[PDB]
Amino acid sequence: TIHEFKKSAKTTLIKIDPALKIKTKKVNTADQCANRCTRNKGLPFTCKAFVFDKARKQCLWFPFNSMSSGVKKEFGHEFDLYENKDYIRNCIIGKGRSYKGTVSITKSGIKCQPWSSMIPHEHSFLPSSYRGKDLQENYCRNPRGEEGGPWCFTSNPEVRYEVCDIPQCSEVE
Amino acid sequence: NTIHEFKKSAKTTLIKIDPALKIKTKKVNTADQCANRCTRNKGLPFTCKAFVFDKARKQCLWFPFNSMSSGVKKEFGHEFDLYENKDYIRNCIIGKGRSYKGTVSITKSGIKCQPWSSMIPHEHSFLPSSYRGKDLQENYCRNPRGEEGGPWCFTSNPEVRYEVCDIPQCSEV
């Protein structure tokens, strides 16, 4: 089930409201964390994310994620953060400046090109500059808040860039 | 094999009233093959948000829309199963979440929801047929009467009749 989750390398989370529940356990792989999180058995909360400590081989299960109020996102080479997609907002507000979901396909249906690649499209949208924008893998993103909404570079030479088809939160009921 | 990742509605296909919308069909063996192609979006002139498996004609129907889209309606049919891509089912709540259609099925304290169709452990009268439009399917967190706490469910723990589920507001600033 590790694919039900958006992965952020080298990242963990820290609670600042001390009331928020946590649960930890030593395991073998990050796979085993995801399994328990998806199945949500033996957890006295809704599992919205977990971190795998690769050094200690420990799962940390959370009823929050990186968008929750009361938690900080910190760098650490031995951690990978896994966020349950059911809790990463999957619709756009305004022009989608704050979109962080995992849709990686354009409106006319082509797979996006990874931001950290210059073939087949050359560009100046590297992760490093645009920190906080989450230009990760090949996700649809709107780093500058432009009118088109989340968009990407297309893995097809004919089309440089195209918007993605992420619905407005206001679209439906 | 990503079919388990989709929200399934049995005995259901979708019809486009609007002739503008695009559909794509292909003869196949199994519903799992429809899921794979939708998941990966391989060779579709659009973003696949849903598909139907026709068990009689052995066909996939891939759609750039779902049951909540404009100009689309459900149609009953014994041969059809509808599968909706969770990435295009709004996973946050508007106001009290009367119109919530997502698949969260665990309460705030981590308890697996009881199916609406079941009287075990708890007897109740929120029968699906009493509440059409409210999607009282499987064991999903729902707010069929639009009450204060947001979506909830009867609980699979005999000790706890019902509990609210922990589903985030789409926008609250």
| B64 chain-A contacts, CB cut-off 8 A | 165
Parallel, antiparallel, or unpaired: how do β-strands B162-164 and B152-154 relate? Answer: antiparallel
Is the Cβ pair B110, A164 closer than 8 Å? Answer: no
How far out from the chain centre does Cα B142 lie? 12
Taking the domain A89-173, which CATH number applies? Answer: 2.40.20.10
**E strand spans, A85-154:** 151-153
Query: Residue A105's beta-bridge partner residues?
Result: A111
Listed residue (B69, B72, B44) closest to A107, CA to CA: B44
Is the Cβ pair A169, B170 closer than 8 Å? Answer: yes
Distance from CA of B39 to the nearest CA of A (A): 10
Alpha-carbon gap, residue B79 to B104, rounded angstroms: 27
A42-63 as b/e: b if 16+ CB within 10 A = ebebbbbbbbbbeeebbbbbbb
Taking the domain A1-88, which CATH number applies? Answer: 3.50.4.10
Q: Calculate the CA dihedral of residues B91, B94, B98, B102 and round it to 10 degrees.
A: 0
DSSP-derived 3-state class of residue B88: helix
CATH architecture of B90-173: Beta Barrel (2.40)
Give the domain ranges of chain A: 1-88, 89-173
| A47 chain-B contacts, CB cut-off 8 A | 110
Strand order in the sheet with B6-16: B6-16, B72-85, B50-54, B59-63, B24-27
Residue with tokens 């073939």: A119
Q: Domain B1-89: which topology?
A: Hepatocyte Growth Factor (3.50.4)
Alpha-carbon gap, residue A25 to A37, rounded angstroms: 12
Alpha-carbon gap, residue A99 to B61, rounded angstroms: 29
Distance from CA of A85 to the nearest CA of B (A): 8
- A6 φ, ψ (degrees, to nearest 5): -85, 125
Q: Of the candidates B46, B88, B168, which has its C-beta nearest A87's C-beta?
A: B168
Residue with tokens 């600033």: B173
Q: How many CB atoms lie within 10 A of CB A172?
A: 17
Residue type, B30: T
Angle at CA B124, nearest 5°, toward B120 and B129?
105
Residue type, B59: Q
Tell me whether domains B1-89 and B90-173 share a fold. no
Alpha-carbon gap, residue B17 to B72, rounded angstroms: 6
Query: Residue B52's beta-bridge partner residues?
Result: B61, B82
Report chain A residues touching chain B, CB-CB < 8 A.
4, 40, 43-47, 63, 85-91, 93, 101-103, 105-109, 111, 164-165, 167, 169, 172-173
Entry resolution (Å) = 2.0
Alpha-carbon gap, residue A33 to A166, rounded angstroms: 29
Alpha-carbon gap, residue A89 to B97, rounded angstroms: 15
DSSP-derived 3-state class of residue B160: coil
Is the Cβ pair A172, B68 closer than 8 Å? Answer: yes
Residue type, B24: K
Distance from CA of B41 to the nearest CA of A (A): 7
Experimental method: X-ray
